[PDB]
Amino acid sequence: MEVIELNKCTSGQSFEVILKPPSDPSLEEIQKKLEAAEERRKYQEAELLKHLAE
Amino acid sequence: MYTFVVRDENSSVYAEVSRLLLATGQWKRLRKDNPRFNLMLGERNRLPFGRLGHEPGLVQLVNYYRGADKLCRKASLVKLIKTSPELSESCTWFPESYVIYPTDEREVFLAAYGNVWIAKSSAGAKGEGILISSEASELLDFIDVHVIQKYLEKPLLLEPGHRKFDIRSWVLVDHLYNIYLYREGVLRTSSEPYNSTCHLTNHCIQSKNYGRYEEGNEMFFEEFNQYLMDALNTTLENSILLQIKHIIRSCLMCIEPAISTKHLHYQSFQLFGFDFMVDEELKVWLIEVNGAPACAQKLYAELCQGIVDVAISSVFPLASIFIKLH
Amino acid sequence: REIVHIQAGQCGNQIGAKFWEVISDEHGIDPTGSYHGDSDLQLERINVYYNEATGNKYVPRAILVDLEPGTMDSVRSGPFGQIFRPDNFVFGQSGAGNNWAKGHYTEGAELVDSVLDVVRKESESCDCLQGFQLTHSLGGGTGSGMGTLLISKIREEYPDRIMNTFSVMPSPKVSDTVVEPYNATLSVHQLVENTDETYCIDNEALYDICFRTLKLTTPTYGDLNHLVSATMSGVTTCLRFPGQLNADLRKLAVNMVPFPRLHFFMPGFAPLQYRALTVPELTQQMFDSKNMMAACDPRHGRYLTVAAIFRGRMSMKEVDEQMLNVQNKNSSYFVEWIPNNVKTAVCDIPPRGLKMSATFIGNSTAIQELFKRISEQFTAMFRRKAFLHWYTGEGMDEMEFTEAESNMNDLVSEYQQYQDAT
Amino acid sequence: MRECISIHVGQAGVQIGNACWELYCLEHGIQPDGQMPSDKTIGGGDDSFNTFFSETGAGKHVPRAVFVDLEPTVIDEVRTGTYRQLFHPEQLITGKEDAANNYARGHYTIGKEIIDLVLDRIRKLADQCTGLQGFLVFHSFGGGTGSGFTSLLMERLSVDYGKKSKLEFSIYPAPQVSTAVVEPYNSILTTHTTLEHSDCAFMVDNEAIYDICRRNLDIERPTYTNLNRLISQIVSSITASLRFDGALNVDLTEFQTNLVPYPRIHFPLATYAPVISAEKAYHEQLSVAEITNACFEPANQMVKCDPRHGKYMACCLLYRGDVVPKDVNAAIATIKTKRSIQFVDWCPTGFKVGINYQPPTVVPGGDLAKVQRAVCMLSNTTAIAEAWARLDHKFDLMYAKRAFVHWYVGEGMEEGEFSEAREDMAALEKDYEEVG
Ligand SMILES: Nc1nc2c(ncn2[C@@H]2O[C@H](COP(=O)(O)OP(=O)(O)OP(=O)(O)O)[C@@H](O)[C@H]2O)c(=O)[nH]1
Ligand SMILES: Nc1ncnc2c1ncn2[C@@H]1O[C@H](COP(=O)(O)OP(=O)(O)CP(=O)(O)O)[C@@H](O)[C@H]1O
Ligand SMILES: Nc1cc(C(F)(F)F)c(-c2cc(N3CCOCC3)nc(N3CCOCC3)c2)cn1
Ligand SMILES: Nc1nc2c(ncn2[C@@H]2O[C@H](COP(=O)(O)OP(=O)(O)O)[C@@H](O)[C@H]2O)c(=O)[nH]1
Ligand SMILES: [Ca+2]
Ligand SMILES: [Ca+2]
Ligand SMILES: [Ca+2]
Ligand SMILES: [Mg+2]
Ligand SMILES: [Mg+2]
Ligand SMILES: [Mg+2]
């Protein structure tokens, strides 16, 4: 058991105790995913309106 | 109304428990994967302890202690006894044992190396997978995780027959971590004279002469005590059971901090089968702890009823065959 | 977040009228639309069902539709008849003759545009329209045929809005004409496709409750409608009053409808006397089949989803203990593959004249029994093409009957499919 | 000094943000009108509390926060509440209608239409920063907005602020505390999309908070306010190091450095003690030894699981009040000889300790008692994977029948995203199993 890195100030203190030692997608890509989902929503609505028009 | 689920169709013990539970009219069996249960009779392996105790408004009890495998596997039991300070490498009631892989203890075993030893594993079932030998070379050639344990060359022999035996004790630990030793144990005897089949007392392995001296090579306490009185002028309680109670209590107290459910969101109980050897000096040795024991046929009724009384109805009350070890 | 309410035909306008009497009384609105209530909770979400007109008057966002004047002259003479916006009465003179085809294809089609004119006018003064609710029967002509024609045209003009119905299913025990199973089978096909939630009110169930439980020797439609407005007030409590809930129509449908076609709900109510009802009695009764308003036995099916709404001041610890007790006594009747599929909701405002009440909403596969019995009555006549001339005389072909029958039998099959799922 | 922007998303994110900033103002002597008499530098400064609060020339101290919700009723309570004068109107952002507990609707449908406005409002906060550390993001796993919009926002924040650290405070669903049927779907979908964009995430299980409120505060039926004031004490303990003079966890980077050896396994377990009822007629103050022992009680963990059956990768003790290092070491020694504390063998068996001398602040007229000392333990243990397995099992039950899936596909999501997110959680479960 060892105490290291003891730092003190007026607000408190901090230290480390050791017991034993050891043995991204781009903007265009996100935009495309959003637009792809919008397009599928647009397709489904058009199928609905086509069914309703029949 | 109380609800339970069954997830080990091969448990003879909890098959009788669930049968009793149903015959009280106040317990209802659900399908295996209905989570809205009070009581789980869990599977032997991969029990999903992490899904217990999160159903709102349900008190949930299970019939296994998470972490009790450390006691109920051979290699891990050896490690537990060696590295637990409360059991210590100085432990007097457990045969000298080393863990050997096909951390490993092959070198320290050779250093120690009557030099007869026995090699086993928990993968060993039905008798095979076991080798008793006097040369360490034959033992290691047979292994290539196993345990190598000092073979007790001087066992207490029942007369007539000049025959080896082992003692099975049943121990119930409830949710309060009370330790209950079933007052009825069983001796599982060899039908063959001991010659240094007559070395392995397992009920399946037992050979002609099977059932000669006792029904199915099983002797119960009343007779064994009576034999100890006639032959040795002593009693089962004095010469053996005091040691058995001490060993049971030591083992179970040792792991209690690691497995206790007293402040957990679900609760556990478990039935253990302890296996002991007696040497010719009436010293008792622990051989193995079994986390999913079967029972002796005559004892199935009494003990299964006792489980419901002590472990189940204590948590789920409706509308002593045990010795409490403390 | 506004709801536009529509009521169509005789049944739909009579039940609708009672609905607005009840909830106007709960929100403190008098028959003249003046608010004279005592709690700000009454007004906090008043905008869901009411528009504010100058003079702090509240006008129901309600549209009243019929193909004949009679029932809507009755509404106008009724107790709260003055509360409705005069422009929101849309009626023809011909009638629909208990004939789905007249409601859907001939007489109704001449009237539907001007109804859609009032709907558009209401929707366009909405800050953010939640969706629409329609009350109708399925056994007559206007609410059934013209009502489902309305839904179709609303869905086309507002394809992204939720559509709900309180639909009265016919029963021979409480029947006006023999063609009701035809009218109801044609409507159920529409509802399967064009509603998000349909509360199934079986007139058989309503009658038996008045006769057996309320001990009414000779129930009238008024007695039946008393049970219905009470249940309607209950299921919309979470929309009308400030709860910790925060649910719009779409959230309700998402949580209650696991498969798009299985959106037909058994509603229920308790109690059905000055005696204080305890929480156990409330919970036991609301799950009792005898308190269900669709004549289906839940023990013959499984619950996919359940909402249980308690109203009044009571112990919630007690509510939860009895809910969890009821589930254990019905463990077999909830599907295991939708975890935590029973919702408990509380509202501290009790209905008129009750200290506490409970509304039940169940998506049960037992509802298939309701459709099965309607299918059987349909087929008994349709095998002999009996009474079909009333429909072919309005230009319908037999094939459209075969399709609607086929579609309903499909619906029944899907319910049995999920009732046996493990 | 280096600034931190807090982002609260959805109802749970907003209401918890309310509770946290109420507490922050109490801890720093900031009145609800934004004034702060102790701050003798008017109009600016680079004190430690300035990492969370900016300053106007009139001396108002303004949270570096944005609140975002897809419907306006929750944030409207902020706009008219006790702390209305604290926030700039641009910081409170509301849409017209919510995501109806549907991740796909919050992520694709409504998210697409509001994300640029949110980013624009965050950019305005960032332009006030001399050296922005990154973001603290508060949301539910279960809500449509909290799951769906947060994951979209996290992706775009990675793009627009590539260098900056992102920390999450995530509310994990519990049926004890009003849940939607589909919250397992939303949880898995948002964890899979957010995993690579989050450096360190603190899960709070509503079940644990609910139980602590029942058992320790004797509240029979906890409200959101009860839950949120308790949660805000734990959040304050975790963020105190960024807002006060100190030497442990001084910047957001240090949370990853100290708690997360492997990027994916970035979910530390929080344990807090003591929680004492304010209406306790008679109470007795707990010692350093006792509150440190309590940190290894599952009943005090933010996520219900069993650390005795996992392994530790890191462990921080954060003390507030009357604590000296000598007491901490004596307490640790005692505990290590009595508790099942197993570290993975490729990590030091140690504790990083921080002590702040100011005892916890409590809301006047609240449920929590003033205590002389308290501690929050942050430990990265494999045991927290229990909560993933629980959630994954409920997902599996519904998804095998495709229950409710049509709602998500109906918003433009593909069924394939379900199984992709589910196979990522399976991998994550295997990761915990490998290290543990
Ligand atoms: N602890 C806590 N949990 C909350 C709070 N509000 C909601 N929740 C939980 O959050 C989950 C629901 O998500 P919400 O945050 O309410 O939903 P949202 O993000 O607004 O999403 P939508 O309303 O669907 O648009 C449920 O599991 C609730 O139990 C809160 O104030 N405190
Ligand atoms: N150290 C030792 N000395 C002497 N005999 C031993 C021994 N270890 C085991 N045996 C004998 O071998 C038999 C089986 O040993 P062990 O208990 O390891 O196998 P097992 O696990 O299959 C029986 P159980 O049904 O209790 O699990 C014992 O009954 C005992 O007779
Ligand atoms: N008519 C009603 C009324 C309700 C309720 F809100 F409960 F009152 C519900 C309802 C059912 C349910 N269920 C049904 C069964 O599965 C659990 C959720 N949830 C909710 N929530 C979930 C998220 O918060 C907003 C409202 C509401 C549905 N229809
Ligand atoms: N519960 C209830 N059912 C009604 C009422 N009026 C009619 N019905 C039922 O509704 C069906 C008749 O439809 P109705 O609404 O009168 O015809 P419509 O005007 O053409 O829509 C039959 O099933 C009747 O039993 C009513 O006021 N209450
Ligand atoms: Ca005409
Ligand atoms: Ca300053
Ligand atoms: Ca990053
Ligand atoms: Mg064995
Ligand atoms: Mg009529
Ligand atoms: Mg919301």
Six token digits for residue B181: 């030793």
C324 touching D (Cβ < 8 Å): no
Return the CATH architecture of domain B64-95+154-326.
Answer: 2-Layer Sandwich (3.30)
- In chain A, the largest separation of any two C-alpha atoms, in whole Å, equals 81
Task: Decide: C141 and C97 in contact? Cβ < 8 Å.
Answer: yes
B:63-122 residues touching chain D, CB 8 A cutoff: 66-67
With tokens 């963020």, the residue in question is D239
As a whole number of angstroms, the distance between CA C361 and CA C197 comes to 11
Task: Decide: D154 and D198 in contact? Cβ < 8 Å.
Answer: yes
Domain ranges of chain B: 1-63, 64-95+154-326, 96-153
* CA separation, residue D59 to residues B14, B138, D27 (Å): 72, 87, 18
CA B7 to chain centre: 21
CA D288 to chain centre: 25
- In this structure, the strands spanning D312-321 and D373-381 are antiparallel
In this structure, the residue with its CA closest to atom 6 of ligand 2 is B151
Question: Dihedrals φ, ψ of D378, to 5°?
Answer: -110, 115
Three-state DSSP class for residue B106: helix
As a whole number of angstroms, the distance between CA B289 and CA B282 comes to 20
Task: Decide: C73 and C96 in contact? Cβ < 8 Å.
Answer: no
As a whole number of angstroms, the distance between CA B125 and CA B123 comes to 6
As a whole number of angstroms, the distance between CA A53 and CA A49 comes to 6
Q: Does one domain contain both D41 and D121?
A: yes
Look up the CATH number of the domain holding residue D54: 3.40.50.1440
Planar angle of CA B1, B5, B9, nearest 5 degrees: 140
Number of domains in chain D: 3
Using CB atoms within 10 A of its CB, is residue D239 exposed (0-12), middle (13-18) or buried (19+)?
buried
Name residues whose C-beta falls within 8 Å of residue D136's C-beta, 6 or more positions apart in sequence: D4, D5, D6, D7, D167, D168, D169, D239, D252
For B1-63, CATH number? 3.40.50.11480
- In this structure, the strands spanning B284-290 and C264-270 are unpaired
* Strand-pair partners of C265: C199
Candidate from A16, A22, A24 with C-beta closest to D345: A22
As a whole number of angstroms, the distance between CA D247 and CA B159 comes to 76
How many C-alpha atoms does C206 have within 13 Å on its Cβ side? 27
How many C-alpha atoms does B146 have within 13 Å on its Cβ side? 19
Q: Does one domain contain both D372 and D405?
A: no
CA distance C249 to chain D (A): 9
Strand order in the sheet with B27-30: B27-30, B2-6, B39-41, B61-62, B267-268
User: Which residues of D are part of the catalytic machinery?
Assistant: 254
**Other beta carbons within 10 Å of D31:** 15
Q: Does one domain contain both D287 and D396?
A: no
Name residues whose C-beta falls within 8 Å of residue B179's C-beta, 6 or more positions apart in sequence: B171, B172, B173, B248, B249, B252, B324, B325, B326
Indicate left, alpha or beta for D166 from its phi (over 0: left) and psi (-120 to 50: alpha): beta
- Run of H or E residues at D257: helix D252-259
As a whole number of angstroms, the distance between CA B166 and CA B277 comes to 5
Q: Does one domain contain both D206 and D296?
A: no
Task: Decide: D291 and D237 in contact? Cβ < 8 Å.
Answer: no
As a whole number of angstroms, the distance between CA C103 and CA C141 comes to 5
Six token digits for residue B293: 């024991």
Q: Does one domain contain both D172 and D278?
A: no
HEC string of C381-413 equals: HHCCCCCCHHHHCCCCCHHHHHHHHHHHHHHHH
Name residues whose C-beta falls within 8 Å of residue B32's C-beta, 6 or more positions apart in sequence: B5, B6, B7
Candidate from D73, D101, D397 with C-beta closest to C255: D101
CA B36 to chain centre: 31
Six token digits for residue B177: 């971590």
D82 is in an annotated binding site: no
Q: What is the 8-class DSSP label of residue D178?
A: -
Return the CATH architecture of domain B96-153.
Answer: 2-Layer Sandwich (3.30)
Spell out which residues line ligand 3, taking CB within 6 angstroms: C 235, 238, 245, 247, 251-252, 255-256, 305-307, 309, 341-343, 345, 361; D 101, 178, 180-181
Of D268, D297, D324, the position where a domain reaches its end is: D268
Q: Which of B214, B210, B188, B192 is nearest to B201 (CA)?
A: B188
Q: Which of C367, C364, C216, C226 is nearest to C302 (CA)?
A: C364
* E strand intervals along D56-141: 61-63, 65-69, 92-94, 132-140
As a whole number of angstroms, the distance between CA D395 and CA C43 comes to 40
Six token digits for residue B82: 């060696």
Q: Does one domain contain both D159 and D178?
A: yes
* E strand intervals along C73-194: 89-91, 131-137, 162-169
CA C261 to chain centre: 17
Q: What is the 8-class DSSP label of residue B226?
A: H
D:37-96 residues touching chain A, CB 8 A cutoff: none
C4 CA to centre of ligand 6 in angstroms: 53
Name residues whose C-beta falls within 8 Å of residue D390's C-beta, 6 or more positions apart in sequence: B50, B51, B54
Q: Does one domain contain both D351 and D408?
A: no
- In chain C, the largest separation of any two C-alpha atoms, in whole Å, equals 61
Candidate from D197, D336, D412 with C-beta closest to A37: D412
B11 CA to centre of ligand 2 in angstroms: 21
Of D349, D368, D383, the position where a domain reaches its end is: D383
Single-letter code of the amino acid located at D88: H
- In this structure, the strands spanning D269-273 and D373-381 are antiparallel
Name residues whose C-beta falls within 8 Å of residue D158's C-beta, 6 or more positions apart in sequence: A24, D166, D197
Query: Measured on CA atoms in the order A32, A35, A39, A40, is the torsion positive or negative?
Result: positive
**Other beta carbons within 10 Å of D183:** 28
C321 touching B (Cβ < 8 Å): yes
C124 is in an annotated binding site: no
Least CA distance to D408: which residue of chain C?
C254
* CA separation, residue D434 to residues D58, D86, D310, D344 (Å): 56, 47, 11, 11
CA-D100 nearest atom, ligand 1: 24
As a whole number of angstroms, the distance between CA C240 and CA C247 comes to 10
Pocket-testing residue among C67, C137, C178, ligand 4, by greatest number of atoms within 8 A of Cβ: C137
Q: Does one domain contain both D24 and D163?
A: yes
Q: What is the 8-class DSSP label of residue A18?
A: E
Q: Does one domain contain both D370 and D323?
A: yes
- DSSP assignment of C286-315 equals HHSGGGBSSS--GGGS-EEEEEEEEEES--
In this structure, the residue with its CA closest to atom 6 of ligand 4 is C11
List the domains of chain C with CATH numbers: 1-258 (3.40.50.1440), 259-366 (3.30.1330.20), 367-422 (1.10.287.600)
Q: Does one domain contain both D335 and D190?
A: no
Contacts of B48 in chain D (CB under 8 A): 389, 393
Indicate left, alpha or beta for D369 from its phi (over 0: left) and psi (-120 to 50: alpha): beta
B247 CA to centre of ligand 8 in angstroms: 18
Q: Does one domain contain both D158 and D28?
A: yes
Least CA distance to D104: which residue of chain A?
A37
* The total number of residues written for chain A in this structure: 54
Q: Chains meeting A at 3+ CB pairs closer than 8 A?
A: C, D
Contacts of C155 in chain A (CB under 8 A): 48, 52
The residue segments making up the domain with residue D389 are 384-436
Q: What is the 8-class DSSP label of residue B183?
A: S
Q: Which of D252, D254, D289, D295 is nearest to D273 (CA)?
A: D295
Q: Which of B140, B101, B136 is nearest to B117 (CA)?
A: B136
Query: Per the CB < 8 Å rule, is C328 touching B36?
Result: yes
CB pairs under 8 A between A and C: 9
Query: Per the CB < 8 Å rule, is A20 touching D345?
Result: no
Q: Does one domain contain both D135 and D273?
A: no
- DSSP assignment of D408-436 equals HHTTT--HHHHHHHHHHHHHHHHHHHHH-
* Strand-pair partners of D354: A14, D318
